[PDB]
Design an enzyme around this catalytic site. Structure first.
Site, PDB file in Angstrom:
ATOM      1  N   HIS B  78       0.843  -1.195   0.000  1.00 33.93           N
ATOM      2  CA  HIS B  78       0.000   0.000   0.000  1.00 33.93           C
ATOM      3  C   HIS B  78       0.879   1.245   0.000  1.00 33.93           C
ATOM      4  O   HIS B  78       1.663   1.447   0.932  1.00 33.93           O
ATOM      5  CB  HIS B  78      -0.911   0.030   1.224  1.00 33.93           C
ATOM      6  CG  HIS B  78      -1.797  -1.164   1.365  1.00 33.93           C
ATOM      7  ND1 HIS B  78      -3.096  -1.181   0.912  1.00 33.93           N
ATOM      8  CD2 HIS B  78      -1.589  -2.366   1.948  1.00 33.93           C
ATOM      9  CE1 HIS B  78      -3.646  -2.350   1.191  1.00 33.93           C
ATOM     10  NE2 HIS B  78      -2.749  -3.089   1.819  1.00 33.93           N
ATOM     11  N   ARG B  79       0.735   2.083  -1.023  1.00 29.06           N
ATOM     12  CA  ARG B  79       1.534   3.297  -1.174  1.00 29.06           C
ATOM     13  C   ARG B  79       0.625   4.495  -0.949  1.00 29.06           C
ATOM     14  O   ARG B  79      -0.180   4.848  -1.816  1.00 29.06           O
ATOM     15  CB  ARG B  79       2.193   3.364  -2.553  1.00 29.06           C
ATOM     16  CG  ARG B  79       3.286   2.328  -2.795  1.00 29.06           C
ATOM     17  CD  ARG B  79       4.570   2.683  -2.060  1.00 29.06           C
ATOM     18  NE  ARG B  79       5.139   3.930  -2.554  1.00 29.06           N
ATOM     19  CZ  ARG B  79       6.164   4.018  -3.402  1.00 29.06           C
ATOM     20  NH1 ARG B  79       6.765   2.919  -3.857  1.00 29.06           N
ATOM     21  NH2 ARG B  79       6.599   5.213  -3.783  1.00 29.06           N
TER      22      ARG B  79
END
Ligand code: ACO
Ligand code: ACO
Ligand code: ACO
Ligand code: CL
Ligand code: CL
Lengths: 206, 209, 209
Positions: B78-79
């Protein structure tokens, strides 16, 4: 599989409390469908065999939500003021034969009447919670809570008081939870209301 | 099924750990009666057969309470700096074919010697916890913890240091967790006391010569 | 009897929700190996048969971590403004006839699109969470969260906005989650990037007047 038959199931404490060191008033309940176990395992590290350890006492008309935690057994042997918190005395290793017992009592955990304990709140050893208090969900209660106080957060902190000061005095005077069962039916409508000044006279005149 | 037979049951980590990426010192133990599972399932999202992921390293003489959590695998793909935090790369869908791998490592999670991690504490990826620290129950530990520091709350914040700066330095030079076992057996009463000065003098006369 | 196979197994919500009062968008997934149960039990005290109760609505492309909690049923019959929080009305004992119902609804819990809900976070009843938000692990969310706002702690408080005000308004206007599949597939590189303005300008040219 699951102690509670349905998510909305609310089973009385005295109906399921098997630990001799747990003291519950009637009508108080725990509704823990979402954690699967009876109230006994909400109460952690309480020896059922001994009478020298800290006890848990809960009043009447309490509501305890799923996965609430009552931490017992003080410091569990860890002395943060000693060089090491590692509990040598309780680990089996002949190299530890001269260890000292770091266990210390905290005092009993006292839960008053008509107190609402939110789901997954954790009560630390020796906490005192006064009558009519509210422990918000996920609270970590490390200090005493005063009657009709509302607390929340980690660690738990003062949010508000439920009622005014003179109103709290009035409720702690009549202490409706101590009344006989035949009497409760009659003041039920006042109980299910905000009229604190009102019910103060039905008890007083009688 | 409960791995433990009683709430007071505390199994050494080296008796129950099976994940090659979990490295544990002697005597450290986990008492997880109230969360059922053995210590492996405390270590979330650690690929047990890959050699290119963050590892969990725990020193010796550590106390780990029930349902302690050690979050691994970094950001799990998850960015937050990308337009979407949805991890297109890791979902099976032909329309996500040109996605980029958002996985980022945090570095190893390192817990030192003589650390007390309270029940249901959550350690975030890449945190280092120095020797003799205390993690209060239900802490959410998002940044490093100095030796002999006490932290709590969510996010975990400084509560206090167990000892003075001079005493902390004394304990770290002594490194009693590394002593020969005969020295440890002989020092067991001093170790169960606050008498750092005395024990440090007793160590010097044994080790300075 | 775990519901998920591995720790990395994330199952789309629309493939594991049975409560008619839980409505889920496409691609949104729950990843709950470490709490064992399917997504339904994440949503607590939600009567599945009735349609006069608070509902849970979740947008598409949401990522939900293990053991996230969604509190429904409003105040559960406990009125803190009444003399007693004890729910006489729902106690079945014969004495409690003239009891009155203390249940008060909180309104629907609404989760927008592209929301990342960290593991073991708890959403309180009636809370609305805007598109693109991030809820940190172990958050206790008592208040509404704005689009693309990051929050955490207990109770949850503002940490930061992910992007600028311009960029956020661009993203809400372009609403990439509502795009036809082919537009989504060809923008997969831009979505795995931080170039909001560039994507916005492309979306304008493909979609304007
Ligand atoms: C559900 C209850 C009754 C157990 C608690 O909620 P209430 O006591 O009704 O809260 P109320 O809505 O009156 O007040 C909101 C405040 O309570 C606080 N609060 C409510 N629930 C929680 C919780 N679980 N943890 C921490 N704080 C909380 C909010 O932070 C808010 O504080 P604010 O003064 O910054 O707004
Ligand atoms: C699973 N995924 C992870 O573990 C990832 O590391 C993440 C996404 C949870 C990390 O979160 P991000 O929001 O990407 O971290 P980022 O570096 O942007 O934010 C740092 C700030 O967030 C705060 N923060 C991070 N996690 C938490 C948490 N669980 N609770 C409260 N605050 C938090 C930090 O305090 C820090 O701010 P401060 O230095 O002013 O206190
Ligand atoms: N397993 C376990 O239960 C491990 C639990 N570990 C503990 O919490 C330990 O018993 C400790 C941290 C309380 C030992 O530290 P002590 O020196 O005994 O704590 P002491 O009561 O002197 O500390 C006072 C402060 O610590 C805070 N504190 C104590 N426990 C916690 C906790 N679990 N989370 C957050 N804060 C805590 C108190 O709120 C108080 O902070 P404040 O003044 O900011 O409100
Ligand atoms: Cl918390
Ligand atoms: Cl928890």
């Amino acid at each position: 599989m699951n102690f509670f038959t349905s998510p909305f199931s609310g089973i009385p404490l005295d109906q399921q409390v098997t630990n001799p060191n747990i003291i519950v008033g009637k009508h108080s309940y725990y509704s823990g469908y979402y954690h699967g176990h009876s109230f006994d395992d909400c109460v952690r590290y309480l020896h059922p065999e001994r009478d020298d350890v800290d006890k848990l006492v809960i009043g009447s008309f309490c509501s305890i939500g799923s996965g609430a935690v009552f931490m017992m057994a003080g410091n569990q042997g860890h002395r943060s003021d000693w060089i090491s918190t590692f509990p040598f005395f309780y680990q089996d290793n002949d190299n530890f034969a001269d260890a000292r017992d770091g266990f210390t009592r905290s005092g009993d955990t006292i839960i008053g009447h008509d107190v609402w304990i939110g789901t997954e709140a954790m009560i630390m050893p020796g906490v005192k919670i006064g009558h009519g208090a509210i422990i918000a969900s996920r609270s970590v209660v490390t200090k005493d809570v005063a009657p009709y106080e509302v607390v929340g957060s980690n660690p738990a902190k003062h949010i508000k008081f439920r009622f005014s000061d003179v109103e709290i005095a009035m409720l702690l005077e009549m202490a409706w939870w101590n009344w006989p069962e035949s009497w409760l039916k009659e003041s039920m409508q006042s109980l299910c209301s905000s009229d604190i000044e009102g019910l103060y006279l039905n008890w007083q005149s009688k």
